[PDB]
């Protein structure tokens, strides 16, 4: 569904701390519940030398904030990764400047969620504008955004 | 907080069937849960001859879809009503053309939710555009929108 990918992505340069400033999804149920399936809070990106992407995130599960470690494997397209789990869901990097923001989407094989990641716990209106522009023609039906207090809390409490 | 109100509103002309096509709120928790406090689905508006506004709506409460009947009392401002309940929360009519869409907000005394109401169970992109433009500088952190199937179901299941 997503036909915006970043050209010339250097995955080594997305390494490090990120904050999930905003998220949106195609179906309300994907982000609705506190333990909704795609309601995940990115902590850190850890590219491997081989160009795979290790992802640390938090997820509300079974009544508490849980730590998760995800491996997204590289594909022939630099901006597209495949998560090794049941149905191989794709991670697509739409746009980044490495030092401030990164926009990405995840999709199955039809559900879709996207996020605006930022480097610091601040509301970046410019990054949010790029996020909303990118989402403009994607079929989203839920959108969440977080304040600086929430961004410094586990699972954005 | 809301400083957009409709000039020349004729409340008699908003009477009848409406659909809650989209909703947004200042705090995620106001719309997050299925039984969230401001997650309400408008059914019908029934102005009184005296210019008060009877509101029929559905709300998820105690595990099921419940019917509610609300009276919003008129004030000296044609576009502003006061709901007779605990803390007198204000209903503000931002914009309408009567025959297609109506944009309104509800606020306490600081929480805020707004909706885009439409006359028919169809996605009205133009009405949604006006909704988003109106919300642009309001401090919203959650937004939901519904599809035509959902609009024809109780509590938008
Ligand atoms: C540039 C990449 C940005 C991060 C990609 C995030 C992928 C998250 C997938 C979580 C799936 C659900 O997570 S799970 O732990 O519950 O299974
Ligand atoms: C032009 C006016 C548009 C409709 C106004 C809707 C006001 C809804 C307030 C519900 C409060 C919560 O509802 S309650 O039944 O749980 O108490």
CA B111 from chain centre, in angstroms, equals 14
Contact present, B81 and B90 (Cβ < 8 Å): yes
CA B8 from chain centre, in angstroms, equals 19
Measuring CA to CA, which residue among A151, A30, A117, A145 is closest to residue B141? A145
| Shortest Cα–Cα distance, A27 to chain B (Å) | 9
Look up residue B38 and give its DSSP letter: T
Question: B94 CB under 6 A from ligand 2?
Answer: no
Q: What proportions of chain B, in percent to the nearest 5, are helix, strand and coil?
A: 15, 40, 40
Give backbone dihedrals phi and psi of A39, rounded to 5 degrees, phi first. Answer: -85, 85
Strand, coil or helix: what is A129? helix
**What is the C-alpha separation between A70 and A45, in angstroms, rounded?**
10
* Residue B149 touches partner A, C-beta closer than 8 Å: no
Angle at A90 between CA A144 and CA B147, to 5 degrees: 45
Measuring CA to CA, which residue among A107, A140, A99 is closest to residue A37? A107
Question: Considering only alpha carbons, which residue of chain A is nearest residue B141?
Answer: A145
Measuring CA to CA, which residue among B30, B23, B41 is closest to residue B111? B30
* Residue A151 touches partner B, C-beta closer than 8 Å: no
* Residue B133 touches partner A, C-beta closer than 8 Å: no
A29 alpha carbon to ligand 2 midpoint, in Å?
Answer: 23
A143 vs B143: CB contact, 8 Å cut-off?
Answer: yes
Q: Show residues of chain B in contact with A143, CB under 8 Å.
A: 142-143
Q: Can you give the length of chain A in residues?
A: 157
| Shortest Cα–Cα distance, A22 to chain B (Å) | 9
Measuring CA to CA, which residue among B123, B136, B138 is closest to residue B20? B123
**What is the C-alpha separation between B56 and B67, in angstroms, rounded?**
7
Question: B92 CB under 6 A from ligand 2?
Answer: no
**What is the C-alpha separation between B53 and B74, in angstroms, rounded?**
7
**What is the C-alpha separation between B111 and A150, in angstroms, rounded?**
17
**What is the C-alpha separation between B20 and B154, in angstroms, rounded?**
12
B107 alpha carbon to ligand 2 midpoint, in Å?
Answer: 10
Q: What are the CA-CA distances from residue A42 to residues A36, A69, A148, A149, A155 (Å)?
A: 15, 10, 15, 16, 9
Give backbone dihedrals phi and psi of A153, rounded to 5 degrees, phi first. Answer: -110, 150
Count H helices, E strands: chain A? 2, 10
Look up residue A21 and give its DSSP letter: E
Look up residue B140 and give its DSSP letter: -
Count the domains in chain A.
Answer: 1
Question: B68 CB under 6 A from ligand 2?
Answer: yes
**What is the C-alpha separation between A102 and A6, in angstroms, rounded?**
10
Q: Which domain holds residue A146?
A: 1-157
Tokens in use for B42? 């408008």
Q: Establish, for the pair of chains A and B, how many residue pairs have beta carbons separated by less than 8 Å.
A: 23
Method used to determine the 3D structure: X-ray
Angle at A39 between CA A70 and CA A21, to 5 degrees: 95
Task: For chain B, give the longest Cα–Cα distance.
Answer: 41
Contact present, A128 and A19 (Cβ < 8 Å): no
In the stretch 53-112 of chain A, residues with CB closer than 8 A to chain B read: none
* Residue A23 touches partner B, C-beta closer than 8 Å: no
Total Cβ atoms within 10 A of residue B37:
15
Return the residue matching tokens 């509301």: A123
Q: For residue B117, give the ligand nearest its CA.
A: 2
Quoted resolution (Å): 1.6
CATH of residue A83: 2.40.128.20
Q: Where are the beta strands (DSSP E) in B62-154?
A: 64-74, 80-83, 90-96, 101-107, 112-118, 142-145
Backbone conformation region of residue A134, classed left if phi is above 0, alpha if psi is from -120 to 50, else beta: alpha
Tokens in use for B17? 């069937």
Chosen from B60, B142, B156 to mutate, greatest number of chain A CBs within 10 A = B142
Q: Do β-strands A90-96 and A101-107 pair in parallel, antiparallel, or remain unpaired?
A: antiparallel
Contact present, A85 and A91 (Cβ < 8 Å): no
């Amino acid at each position: 569904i997503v036909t915006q990918t970043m050209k010339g992505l250097d995955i080594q340069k997305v390494a490090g701390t990120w904050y999930s400033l905003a998220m949106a999804a195609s179906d309300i149920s994907l982000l609705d519940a506190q333990s909704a399936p795609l309601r995940v809070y990115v902590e850190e990106l850890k590219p491997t030398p081989e160009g795979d992407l290790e992802i640390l995130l938090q997820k509300w599960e079974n009544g508490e904030c849980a730590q998760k470690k995800i491996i997204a494997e590289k594909t022939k397209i630099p901006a597209v990764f495949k998560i090794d789990a049941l149905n191989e869901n794709k991670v697509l990097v739409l746009d980044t400047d490495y030092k401030k923001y990164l926009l990405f989407c995840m999709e199955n094989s039809q559900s879709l969620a996207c996020q605006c990641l930022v480097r610091t716990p601040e509301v970046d209106d410019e990054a949010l504008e790029k996020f909303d522009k990118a989402l403009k023609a994607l079929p989203m039906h839920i959108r969440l955004s977080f304040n600086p207090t929430q961004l410094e809390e586990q699972c954005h409490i």
